[PDB]
């Protein structure tokens, strides 16, 4: 019993982190096989980052201008190309600790663990959600760029995020591992702001299922609703529309608790209209939307990783 924000074990990803320096800019890289991936603004100075021409900055660099270190050991660079907003450095050494891995572009609503790194060294690990507005609510200081987000499936690391920047309001924006930003952001120091966020409805329901499973049941009402009516009521509270796909994905939790999704939807409708009136759910005074149905099942049924 118990329900916690839980990150994936970070060890497979720890073994991949390196420090990348170019000129006087240092940030983190990901060393998979004989390639190091990092944000392309490693090639900038402070000044440059106000409005950089990356293609131009990169033409003036040679392999030797990039210093890659894995602990004590310097890796010798033997190639470089830019792909979108990421830089690929080919190195003379394959990483012996390369885990089985993939590069995924996740969807808004999906969660992942971030391994926050400074100078190629791990600081800590925490769980995030890709927000509807394509930001994450992270914890990132100067030096954290090139920190990565990932999911583990059995033995395979799916890398889905690399950290680039912070926006007003202290939210965070980044790219997939092919260097495409999530959302409409660009890697320059100019005024940019995140769209208005919305609440990830399917995740809130997953969390309510987790609460029932943990014996917190006070909010269960005796009603049903339809998907139509629920969505009209949720729309005014800035909840995303719940689709039939969402309903189907919540099927396992539904079957496991013997509570139909639309009866839980009835319960959430009531909580949105009446508030929690001094009560908590799973220790929280606010509804939580950063647990996916998968995260709930994984946690409440004990799924592990080799």
Ligand X SMILES: *[C@](O)(C(=O)N1CCC1)[C@H](CN1CCCC1=O)NC(=O)[C@@H]1[C@@H]2[C@H](CN1C(=O)[C@@H](NC(=O)C(F)(F)F)C(C)(C)C)C2(C)C
Closer CB to a second copy, 6 or 106, in the complex: 6
Which of 194, 211, 224 lies closest to 280 in space, CA to CA? Answer: 211
- Cα 273 → chain centroid: 30
Return the sign of the alpha-carbon dihedral for residues 118, 120, 123, 129: positive
3-state SS class at 163? strand
Q: Is 145 a catalytic residue?
A: yes
Which helix (H) or strand (E) segment holds residue 234: the answer is: helix 227-236
**Site track for a second copy across 225-264, x = CB under 8 A:** ----------------------------------------
Rounded Cα distance between 128 and 259, Å, is 27
Q: Cβ atoms within 10 A of the Cβ of 61, count? A: 16
Q: How far is the CB of 163 from ligand X (least distance, A)?
A: 6
Residue 284 engages Cl ion in binding (rule: CB under 5 A): yes
Which of a second copy, Cl ion, ligand X, none lies near 115, with the C-beta cut-off 5 to 8 A by kind? a second copy
Query: Among residues 41, 163, 172, 246, which one is catalytic?
Result: 41
Contact 179, 270 (CB under 8 A): no
Query: Among residues 22, 145, 160, 265, which one is catalytic?
Result: 145
Closer CB to ligand X, 57 or 204, in the complex: 57
Rounded Cα distance between 182 and 121, Å, is 25
**Site track for a second copy across 112-131, x = CB under 8 A:** ---xxxxx-xxxxxx-----
Rounded Cα distance between 214 and 221, Å, is 17
Q: Is 160 a catalytic residue?
A: no
Size of the site for a second copy (CB under 8 A): 54
Q: Which residue's Cβ lies closest to ligand X?
A: 145
Rounded Cα distance between 35 and 94, Å, is 8
| Residue 206, both tokens | 């997953």
Residue 286 engages Cl ion in binding (rule: CB under 5 A): yes
Residue 301 engages a second copy in binding (rule: CB under 8 A): yes
Which of a second copy, Cl ion, ligand X, none lies near 27, with the C-beta cut-off 5 to 8 A by kind? ligand X
Give one word for 220, left, alpha or beta, with left for phi > 0 and alpha for psi -120 to 50: beta
Which of Cl ion, ligand X, a second copy, none lies near 7, with the C-beta cut-off 5 to 8 A by kind? a second copy
Which sequence positions are flagged as catalytic?
Answer: 41, 145
Q: Which residues form the interface with a second copy (CB under 8 A)?
A: 1-12, 14-15, 71, 115-119, 121-126, 137-144, 166, 170-172, 214-215, 280, 283-286, 298-306
């Amino acid at each position: 019993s118990g329900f916690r924000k839980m990150a994936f074990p970070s060890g497979k990803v720890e073994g991949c982190m390196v420090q990348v320096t170019c000129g006087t800019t240092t940030l983190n890289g990901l060393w998979l096989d004989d390639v190091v991936y990092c944000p392309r603004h490693v090639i900038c100075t402070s000044e440059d980052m106000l409005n950089p021409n990356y293609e131009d900055l990169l033409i003036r660099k040679s392999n030797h201008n990039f210093l890659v270190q894995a602990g004590n050991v310097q890796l010798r660079v033997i190639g470089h190309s830019m792909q979108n907003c990421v830089l690929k450095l080919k190195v003379d050494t394959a990483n012996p600790k390369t885990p089985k891995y993939k590069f995924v572009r996740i969807q808004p609503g999906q969660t992942f663990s971030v391994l926050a790194c400074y100078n190629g060294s791990p600081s800590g690990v925490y769980q995030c959600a890709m927000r509807p507005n394509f930001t994450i609510k992270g914890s990132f200081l100067n030096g954290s760029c090139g920190s990565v987000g990932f999911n583990i499936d059995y033995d395979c690391v799916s890398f889905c995020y690399m950290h680039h920047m912070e926006l007003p309001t202290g939210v965070h924006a980044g790219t997939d591992l092919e260097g495409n930003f999530y959302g409409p952001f660009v890697d320059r120091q100019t005024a940019q702001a995140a769209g208005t966020d919305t609440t990830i409805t399917v995740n809130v329901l997953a969390w309510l299922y987790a609460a029932v499973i943990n014996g917190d049941r006070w909010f269960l009402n005796r009603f049903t609703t339809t998907l139509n009516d629920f969505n009209l009521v949720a729309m005014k509270y800035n909840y995303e529309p719940l689709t039939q796909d969402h309903v189907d994905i919540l099927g396992p939790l539904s079957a496991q608790t013997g509570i139909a999704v639309l009866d839980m939807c009835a319960s959430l409708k009531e909580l949105l209209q009446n508030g929690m009136n001094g009560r908590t759910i799973l220790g929280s005074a606010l509804l939580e939307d950063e647990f996916t149905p998968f995260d709930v099942v994984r946690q409440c049924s004990g799924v592990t990783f080799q």
